[PDB]
Fold this protein.
Amino acid sequence: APWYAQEVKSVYQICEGCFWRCGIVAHAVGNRVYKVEGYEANPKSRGRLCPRGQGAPQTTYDPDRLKRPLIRVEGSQRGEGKYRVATWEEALDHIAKKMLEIREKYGPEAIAFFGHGTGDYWFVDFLPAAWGSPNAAKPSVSLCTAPREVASQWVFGRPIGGHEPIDWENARYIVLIGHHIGEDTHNTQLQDFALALKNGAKVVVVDPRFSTAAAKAHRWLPIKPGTDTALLLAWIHVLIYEDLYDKEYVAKYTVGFEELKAHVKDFTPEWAEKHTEIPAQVIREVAREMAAHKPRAVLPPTRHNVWYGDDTYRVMALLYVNVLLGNYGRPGGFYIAQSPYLEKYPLPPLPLEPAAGGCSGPSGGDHEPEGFKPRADKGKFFARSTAIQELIEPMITGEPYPIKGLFAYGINLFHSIPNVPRTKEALKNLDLYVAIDVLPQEHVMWADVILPEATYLERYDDFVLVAHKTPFIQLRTPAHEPLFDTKPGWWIARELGLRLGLEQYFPWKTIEEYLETRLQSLGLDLETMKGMGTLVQRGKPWLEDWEKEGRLPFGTASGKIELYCQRFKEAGHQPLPVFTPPEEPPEGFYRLLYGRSPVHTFARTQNNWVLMEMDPENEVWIHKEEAKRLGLKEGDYVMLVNQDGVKEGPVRVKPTARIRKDCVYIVHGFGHKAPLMRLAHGRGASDNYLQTRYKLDPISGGAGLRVNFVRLEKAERPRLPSLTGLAKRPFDER
Amino acid sequence: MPRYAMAIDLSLCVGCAACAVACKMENEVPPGVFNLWIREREVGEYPNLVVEFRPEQCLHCENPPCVPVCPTGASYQTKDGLVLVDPKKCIACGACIAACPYDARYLHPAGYVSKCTFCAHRLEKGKVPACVETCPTYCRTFGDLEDPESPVAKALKAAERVDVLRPEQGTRPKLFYLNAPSKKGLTRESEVH
Amino acid sequence: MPRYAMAIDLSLCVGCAACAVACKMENEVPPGVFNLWIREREVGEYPNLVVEFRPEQCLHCENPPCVPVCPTGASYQTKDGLVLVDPKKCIACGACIAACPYDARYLHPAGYVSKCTFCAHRLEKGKVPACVETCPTYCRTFGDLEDPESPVAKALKAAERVDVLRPEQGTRPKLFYLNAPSKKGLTRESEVH
Amino acid sequence: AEFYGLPNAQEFWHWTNALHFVLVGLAGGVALLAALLHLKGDAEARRYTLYALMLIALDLFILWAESPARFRFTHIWLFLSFHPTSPIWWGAWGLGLGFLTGGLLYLGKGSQRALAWALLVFSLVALSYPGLALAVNLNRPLWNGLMAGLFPLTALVLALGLAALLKSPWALFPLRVLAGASLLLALLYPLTLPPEARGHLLEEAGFWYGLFLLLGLGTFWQERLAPWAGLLAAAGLRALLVLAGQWQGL
Amino acid sequence: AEFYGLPNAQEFWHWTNALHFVLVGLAGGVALLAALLHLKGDAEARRYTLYALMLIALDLFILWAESPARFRFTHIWLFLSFHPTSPIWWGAWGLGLGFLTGGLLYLGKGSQRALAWALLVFSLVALSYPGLALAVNLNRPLWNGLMAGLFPLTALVLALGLAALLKSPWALFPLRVLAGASLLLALLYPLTLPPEARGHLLEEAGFWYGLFLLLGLGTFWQERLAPWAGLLAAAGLRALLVLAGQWQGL
Ligand SMILES: Nc1nc2c(c(=O)[nH]1)N[C@H]1C(S)=C(S)[C@@H](COP(=O)(O)OP(=O)(O)OC[C@H]3O[C@@H](n4cnc5c(=O)[nH]c(N)nc54)[C@H](O)[C@@H]3O)O[C@H]1N2
Ligand SMILES: Nc1nc2c(c(=O)[nH]1)N[C@H]1C(S)=C(S)[C@@H](COP(=O)(O)OP(=O)(O)OC[C@H]3O[C@@H](n4cnc5c(=O)[nH]c(N)nc54)[C@H](O)[C@@H]3O)O[C@H]1N2
Ligand code: SF4
Ligand code: SF4
Ligand code: SF4
Ligand code: SF4
Ligand code: SF4
Ligand code: SF4
Ligand code: SF4
Ligand code: SF4
Ligand code: SF4
Ligand SMILES: [Mo]
C-alpha cells in the first residue's frame, strides 16, 4: 500500500513550483509522482526542497485540472463560461486561422503574447519573435523585477538575474529592504540565508511589517512605507560623508562617484528620519555597522520591486551602497554570475531579436525605422523592457495601433496584472484570446480556446540554464506520460509554429531530438544528461579571476556610480532624488501591502489540496490598536474596500501587531472567482482585485502596486465548502 | 540500542511548512489530518517583538502515555524509542488520542489510528526522515541520542537552550527544541491574553 | 499601581547564603523557618557538569493561590503586587500553606503565618529589600516591573533567559530567575529521579 | 495562534460514544443489581440478569457499531492480550466475562453464588472503567480524578432509576441516596478545576450542566418524575463530561 | 538537592487536623441525617438534631483547640468577612449557621421544617467543604479532584456508621451503600494519580491504605462489626489522605 514499498521509477526533474526551478528527483510508481526530492549535486536544491516544491505535484493529480482542448461556444460572451471540447487538431487550427486573419489586416504585432513559467521560452521568447510580434511580456518584468534589472544594467554591466548572485555564505552583515525571506520561500536562498544566520550573520530588516525575516533579524527598522529611498540616500550620505566607504574599490571600478557625493549633500540622517520615521541614530548606526564589515556587508536587492512609481531610483541607491561597501564581485555578497555554455539549437535568426539594453540607445532605435511596428508601450517609460501592463491599453482604445488577439501562456491575467476591470474590457475587445494552462482559473475561462498543458512532471522542457558561481544546466525528464488529453508546451508551440509558416523554426521532430543537439555540443547525449540531472560548468565569481585575465565585467568599463549618461541627457534626472514623498492613505484607509505565503505560489496553488490544507486563506494584518478602534477581533472577517470602491471577498482579520498603523497586509493570490477550481474558489481577498490603480515607473516600465489604499468593513464569516471534502475527491486518470 | 530523537532549532526555523508538506507526501497522510504542522505565535509589542515558528508532531515520548492506555496492544514503544501503531491490532478506540498531550494522533480513514512514525520505514533502511531531508533551513536533526556523533546529539550539545512541550506531563519527549526565540521559552496559549 | 518584582541572575548566584542570612537578621525570622533559602543542585557527568544555585522565597505571585484560600482575609494582595499577611486576622489554619506551591510560607511561632514580605517595611521608607541590599554578587534586582528604569526591568531586559518556578501553576511568579545555568532550564527533582 | 496545517485537536469521542458512556453505566449498574439480587437470593435476580445481559449486549453492539474499525475485525485483540494498564481493556473483560457469568446465571449452569460474586466483581470492573478511561488522561484538565467518582455513582443512578421505572420497590430509596451523592459531587466538580478549565467547562457547557444539576433535583420531589429526572440528570451529566472534556487546552 | 536553610515543606496539618477532618465528616453527615429526619417527619429527628449539635460543637472546639491562633482570638474574622472562594470560610458558616439552625430546631421555636431546609443546605456546605479544602490546592498532586468526592462520601459513611451503632433501623443499608460507593472510589483513587504521586502514596501510606480498604469490606459482614469496620475504614482514609497529601512534589 505505501508508495515507497511499491515499485518506483525515479527521474531527474525540475520543479515548476515557481520560477526558481530547483532540480529535483521525482519518484513515481506507475503514473503518479508520490514524492519529489531535492538532490545534492544540484546547486539549487542541494538535497532540500521548500513546501511548494514538495506539494507541487498534486496539480497533476487534481480532478479539476484541465484535460481537453476547449473552444468557446459561438455566440457566447467571453466571461460567460460556455465551452465545447475540441481536438488538439481542431483547436490548433482554429487558433492559426484566427491569428492569420489578425495578421492580414493588422500585422503580426497585433498579437500580444503574455506568459510565464519554463515554457515561456516558447510562448514569450521564441514563438512571438518567430512570429514577428514585439508585444511579448511576462509579469516578472514590469510586475516584479524591472526596477532592479534596469538599475543593475545601468550601474553594473550586468543583470541581477533569476538566482540573485549573493555570496550569502561569506556575508557578515545583511540588510534586507522588503525582502521577506522565509515567506518568500525560494529554496536556495532560504538555505543560504539560514546558513548565514547560522554562521553568525547578523541581518537588518527594513519593512513596515515585522515579517519572518524580521523575526530573525538583529535590527528591524519599521520604515514608513514608500520611503526607502530616503533611508538609502541617507546611508549613502553616511558612508560618503563620514568617510566609511571603500576608497580603493570606488577608485578602481567606479565611474562618476563625485556626482553622488554632491547630490547626497543634504540627505542626512536627520533629513531621512523625518520622512522615514526611523530615528537618525539608527540610520547612522546601520551604515557604520555595515561599513565595519565590508566587503562582507550586503544589501541584497529584493526581487519584487514595483512598490511605488519611483522604484528604479530606490534600487539604484541600494546598489550604490553596495558599491560604496566594495562588495560586488568580492566574497561577501556578490560573486559574478556567469551563464553556462549550452549551445543553442541551430536556426535562422528570428524575425525580431532582443535588445538586452543598458546603454547608448537601447530604447526604440530598432523600433522607429527598423522594419515594422514597435512594442506598443514604446513611449511610456524610459527603459526598453516590455511592460505587460502597458500593452493592455492598446487592446481597448486601439491607441498605438491595435492589439486584437492575445495569448496567455501560464500567466494569471486577473491576479498578476493590476486593474482587472481594464484587463476584462481588453479581453472583450479582442478578436482572439488563447490561454494555455492547467487549471480552470478565472482568466482561462474567458478564452476563445483553452489548451491544456502537460504538467512539469509529465513533460520535457528545453534546458534550464542558471547563471551562477558555478553555472549549471538542468534537465527535466518526464516522470510519466501526460494525462488525459494533455500536451507539452514545446509540442503546442511547434504545432502552432508549423501552422503559421514557421517550420524553419521548429524543424526538429521531437524535443529529445532537440535536446540531443545541445548535448552534442557539450560532450554528451540525452541518456547521460538524464544520468546527472544537472551539469555544472566552470565559470567565475569574484573580481580577481576577471582582473588577472586583464578584463572587468559591466556594461562600459567601470561601473558608473551615479550610473547612466544617456538618461541624464534626454530624460531629465540621473540621480535617485525621487525619494518623492509618497501619497498617503486617506484617513479611514490603509496602504495595502502584500506578499507571499511560504506554502502558496502566487495564485496557482490555491487549488492544491496539500497546500491549501496548510494555508486555506489569507488573513489581513492590521495593527492590534487599529482593529480595536475598528470593532474587529481575532476571528472576524472583513471586506477590503479600496479607494475606488472595489470590495474584496471576506478575509480573516489578523489583529496581531507586527505592522505599522498605516498599513494593512494580505498574501497575494487568494480571492479567486473561479468556480471550477473547486477548492480555491471563494477563499480570501485578492490583492490584485483591489489594486485598481498603479504608479507607472517612468524609468523601468514597472507598475507600482503599493499605491492602493484599502479600508476594512465588517463582514460575515464566509460559508464555504469543506476543503477536506473537496481534497478527498479521488484522482481518476479516467 | 539507539534511543531515537529529533532536534529542531527554532532560531533557524522560519515556519515554511516544508517538512509538513514533505511528510504529507512521503507518508500519504490523508487530507484532514496531519502528523506534522507548524504553529506560529508572536510575542510582544514594538521594541521586543518575537515570533516563534514551531513544528509540532509526535515527540516519540520516552514515557509515552499513549501506549499503556491501549487495550489491544496496537500502540507500542520500540526498543530504540519509537512509538508506533500496529494497525492490525488497532480498534480505533481513541484512547491514545485522549492520552497524547500533543494532538499528535488521528484517526486515519482506513479505520485505525495514525501519526508521525519517525519515518520508521526510512529508518529501517538507513535513511533519515522526510522532514529532516527536505528542510531548507537545516534546523532539524535526527539520530541516536546515545551516539555522541549523531546529528541530534551534536545539535543538543551545541544548543543555547533546550525545550520540550508540556514537560510537566511526564512524557519525556524525544523532540527537542533548540534555542527558542522567546526568553521565557516555548510559547503557550495560556501566556496570551 | 506599580508591579513589584525581584529578579535573580543565576549565572551570578554562587549560593553563598548572604541574602538568606540578611533576611533572617532583618525580619528576625525565628529558628527553624525561612523566608528565603538556597537550593543547590548538580546536573551531571564530568564534561558536562552544571550546578544551579537557586535562592527560593515568596515569589509574590501575581495570581496567588494563597490569597483566595484564606477565610479570614489576612492573606491579601496589595495594589502593587505584594502578597502579605495581616496577622490580626490570621487564624493560622494553614490553608495558604496548603495552596502555596513553593513552600514559601510558615507558621510563625507567634501563631500566624509568615513568609517573605518583599521587605514591605523598607519599601515604604523607600529602600530596597535586605537580601537585595547585601548581595555580593549583584545578582538580585528589584523594582517596579512597569517602570523601565527599574533594576528588575532592566535585568529582565538584559537576560538571556527568564524562568519561573512551576509556571504550569496558576501563579505568575513575580520573582524571575534570570540566566539559568542548565540548558533545560530550572532544575527539577523529577528530572533527577 | 496561526498554523500551517493543524494539530489534531478535534473531538475524538462523539455523541455516539457519549451514548456508549451512558449505556455502559446502565449496563454495569444493572449487572450490579442483578448480582446483588442473586446474592440476597431475591426472586427478581433473574430478570435483572437478563437486562444486564441485554444492556451489555446493547453496549458491546454500539461499541462495535461506532468503531471506525468495526469491519476490520480487530477487537479480537482485546481478548487475546493482557493490558492491565488500560481502562478500556479492563472494560472489555469486565463486561465480556460479566456477560458470560450472567449468561450462566440465567441458564442455571456452572454453579450460582460463585457466579453471583463473579458477576459482582465484573460489574464493579465495568462500573469503574469509564471514569478511569477519562481520568487517566492527565493532559485533559476536565477529566480529573472526580471522573473516577462521578462515573461509578452516575452509572448507579441510571441502573436504579431504571429499576424504579420497572417499579422494583427497593431502589427508589437507593436511587435518591446515590442521586444525592452524584449531584453533590457534580456540583462541586467545577470547583475542583483550575480556573481556566472551569471557565472552559462553563463557556462550552454549564447552562446544560446547571440544567442537569437542577433536573436531577426532581429525583427528591414527585414520586414518578423522580426516576426520569434522575436518569436524565445522570445521563446528561455523563455525556456532557465526555464531550466537553476533550480539551488539552492552555 | 542540597540547601542552605530549608524550604518550609514541613507537614502543616498534623494528626490533630486529621482528627478534625474525621469529626467534621461526622458533624456534617449527622447534620444531614437530622434535617432529612426532620423533613421526613420522623420521630428521631430530634435525637439526631441534638448529636449533630454536639458533633458540630466538638469539631468547632477541636478546630480552635488545635489552632496556634487560638489565644489570639482571631476567629471572629471568620465571621466578619465575605470570602466565598475559601473552602474553610464556607465551613465556618456552614457549621455556624448549621448550628444556630439546629438550635432553633431543637428548641422547637422560631420556625419549623422550613428550617430543616436550611439545615439541609448548611449540612451540604459542611459535607462539601473539607474535600474541597484539600482539592482546591492544585499544587498538591495527591489532593486531586476525587477528594471532593471521597470526603462527602466518607462523611456519610461516618454519620450512618454512628447512626447504625445507635441502632437506628434505617442506617445500615444506606451505610452499606455509601460505604460501597466510598470504598470503590477509594480503590480507584490511586489509579487516578500520576505515577510519581501514586508511588509516593504507596510508599508513604497504602498498607495503611490497603488496610482500611480491606477493613471497610467489613461493612458487608455481620452487624456490630459492620458499622465499626466501615467507620474505621472511613476515618482511616480521611486521616491518611490529609496526612499523606501534604506533598508538593516533583
Ligand atoms: N497583484 C500582484 N501581482 C503580482 C504579484 C503580486 O504580489 N501581486 N507578484 C508579481 C510577481 S512578483 C510575479 S513573479 C508574477 C507571477 O505571475 P504569474 O506566474 O502569472 O502567477 P500565478 O498566479 O502562479 O499564475 C500562474 C498561471 O500559470 C498557470 N500554470 C502553472 N503551471 C503551469 C504550466 O506548467 N503550464 C502552463 N501552461 N500553465 C501553468 C497557473 O494555473 C496560473 O494560471 O506575478 C506578479 N504579479
Ligand atoms: N512562497 C513563495 N515564495 C516566493 C514566491 C511565491 O509565489 N511563493 N514568489 C517569488 C517571487 S517571483 C518573488 S518576486 C518574491 C516576492 O518576494 P519579495 O521579493 O521578497 O518581495 P518584497 O516585495 O521585497 O517583500 C515583501 C515585503 O515587502 C514589504 N514592503 C511593502 N512596502 C514596503 C516599503 O515601502 N518598504 C519596505 N522596506 N518594505 C515594504 C512588505 O511588508 C513585505 O514584508 O518571492 C518569491 N518567492
Ligand atoms: S523554490 Fe520551491 S516551489 Fe520554487 S521551484 Fe524550488 S522547490 Fe519548487
Ligand atoms: S522545513 Fe524547516 S523551516 Fe520549514 S517548518 Fe520544517 S523545520 Fe521549519
Ligand atoms: S485507537 Fe488503536 S492504537 Fe489507540 S488505543 Fe485504541 S487500539 Fe490502541
Ligand atoms: S508525542 Fe504523542 S504519540 Fe508520541 S509518545 Fe507522546 S503521546 Fe505518544
Ligand atoms: S519523521 Fe516521518 S512522520 Fe515525522 S514528520 Fe518526518 S516524515 Fe512525517
Ligand atoms: S546573595 Fe545572590 S548568590 Fe548569595 S544567596 Fe542570595 S541570590 Fe544567591
Ligand atoms: S493561616 Fe492565616 S493567612 Fe493563612 S489562610 Fe489561614 S487565616 Fe489566612
Ligand atoms: S509563592 Fe506561594 S506564598 Fe508566595 S505569593 Fe505565591 S502562592 Fe503565595
Ligand atoms: S525581600 Fe525582605 S523578606 Fe524577602 S527574602 Fe529579601 S530580605 Fe527577606
Ligand atoms: Mo516575481
